Design brief:
The structure is cut from a larger assembly and holds two copies of chain A (63 residues). By secondary structure, the first copy, chain A, is an all-alpha fold. Chain A contains three helices and no strands. Chain A starts with a helix and ends with a helix. Chains A, B: It is found in: Cytoplasm; Nucleus.
Chain lengths: 63, 63
């Protein structure tokens, strides 16, 4: 029915990343940053992806 | 005093655009592509251009 605001934020954030990273189309890595920024593991002990600094490290090492 | 982070980035991005198009020198056309990647006008509801999709086509629409 909807992408919700949950993805309005993620998908649009990926677009924001594109300006930061200088390219007209959303890279899989840019959408990965957006996903990772909003992603979480909803358990009693919150778990999460390595923070964005490592994600960026790898996003810079690869391509 | 400064060109802002914004023109620093736009003028250098225009060089990046040369590289995407395989052009020898920065064109005014390239500056416009760089501006599309970084075009955002401060407002509550900000104005902006499409990152780059339309301008690639619009470059073809020039002689």
């Amino acid at each position: 029915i909807t992408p919700s605001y949950a993805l309005g934020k993620v998908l649009q954030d990926a677009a924001k990343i594109q300006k930061q990273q200088k390219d007209s189309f959303i890279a899989q890595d840019h959408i990965l940053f957006a996903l990772f920024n909003d992603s979480s593991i909803q358990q009693i002990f919150k778990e999460a992806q390595v923070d964005i600094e490592a994600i960026k490290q790898q996003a810079l090492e690869l391509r």
